[PDB]
Amino acid sequence: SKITSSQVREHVKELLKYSNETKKRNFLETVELQVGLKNYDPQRDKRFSGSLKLPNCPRPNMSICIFGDAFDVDRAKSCGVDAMSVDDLKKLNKNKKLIKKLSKKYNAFIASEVLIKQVPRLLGPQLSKAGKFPTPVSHNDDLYGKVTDVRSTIKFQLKKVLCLAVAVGNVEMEEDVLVNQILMSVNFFVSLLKKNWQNVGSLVVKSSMGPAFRLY
């Protein structure tokens, strides 16, 4: 690893110093990692995609919708998470303006194993175009646990642009937790990346309403 833990600790220290004390903001500020990869071609090279689950959640309150069956909706009443049924999805009747409104409403979607087949048939491909596609859930697993999991998901997918960005966590967390999460995210990124630590163009740490800080 070219990046060192003490340098991460230092840069996190002035980042939290700027975010917390000097210029506090009313909205909670998310810490962002913005990466750019180098000597890489989206068209020819394999398009890497991967996901990791952070231990402490970056975004506790981000909106999630659960497409679900009878059992999934009944459990979702206990979870307190917004849900529309298969009958509701049929009532939508593939109307583009309303489903675009739903896609801009909800950042994340969780769907059942049974209904994940016809989620494209009822809804179409505009979810894949946006990049928000429902994540599978089963009857055995806990919905609120997987809501916490999806809220803690970090995903790197190549697409077409050679620069990516993820949300490591909040400003308000503790410094060692922030250091550990940014280190494991960089390690996950270089694990997905071929010819690791040399196709890394630039790594940037930032806070929401904050200046950029360059880690190599």
Partner 1 sequence: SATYPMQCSALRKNGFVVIKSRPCKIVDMSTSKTGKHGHAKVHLVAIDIFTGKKLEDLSPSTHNMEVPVVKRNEYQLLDIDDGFLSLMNMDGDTKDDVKAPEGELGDSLQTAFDEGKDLMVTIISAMGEEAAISFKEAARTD
Whole-number minimum distance, CB 39 to RNA, in Å? 10
Whole-number minimum distance, CB 15 to RNA, in Å? 12
Answer with the entry of RNA, partner 1, none that 77 interacts with (C-beta below 5 to 8 A by kind): none
Answer with the entry of RNA, partner 1, none that 114 interacts with (C-beta below 5 to 8 A by kind): none
DSSP 36-51: EE-S--TTTS---EEE
Residues sharing a CB contact under 8 Å with residue 165, sequence separation 6 or more, in sequence order: 32, 33, 34, 35
Answer with the entry of partner 1, RNA, none that 117 interacts with (C-beta below 5 to 8 A by kind): partner 1
Positions that interact with RNA (CB under 7 A): 23, 25-27, 30, 32, 34-36, 38, 59, 62, 97, 100-101, 103-104, 107, 126, 129-131, 160-167, 201-202, 204, 206, 208-212
Answer with the entry of partner 1, RNA, none that 91 interacts with (C-beta below 5 to 8 A by kind): none
Strand boundaries in the chain, DSSP class E: 30-37, 49-53, 64-67, 82-84, 108-112, 135-137, 153-157, 163-170, 200-207, 213-215
CA distance 193 to 40: 10
| Closer by beta carbon to partner 1, 13 or else 117 | 117
Q: Give first-to-last CA distance, the chain, whole Å.
A: 11
3-state secondary structure at position 160: coil
Q: Taking a C-beta distance cutoff of 8 angstroms, is the pair 68, 115 a contact? A: yes
| Closer by beta carbon to RNA, 120 or else 201 | 201
Whole-number minimum distance, CB 138 to partner 1, in Å? 9
Whole-number minimum distance, CB 195 to partner 1, in Å? 16
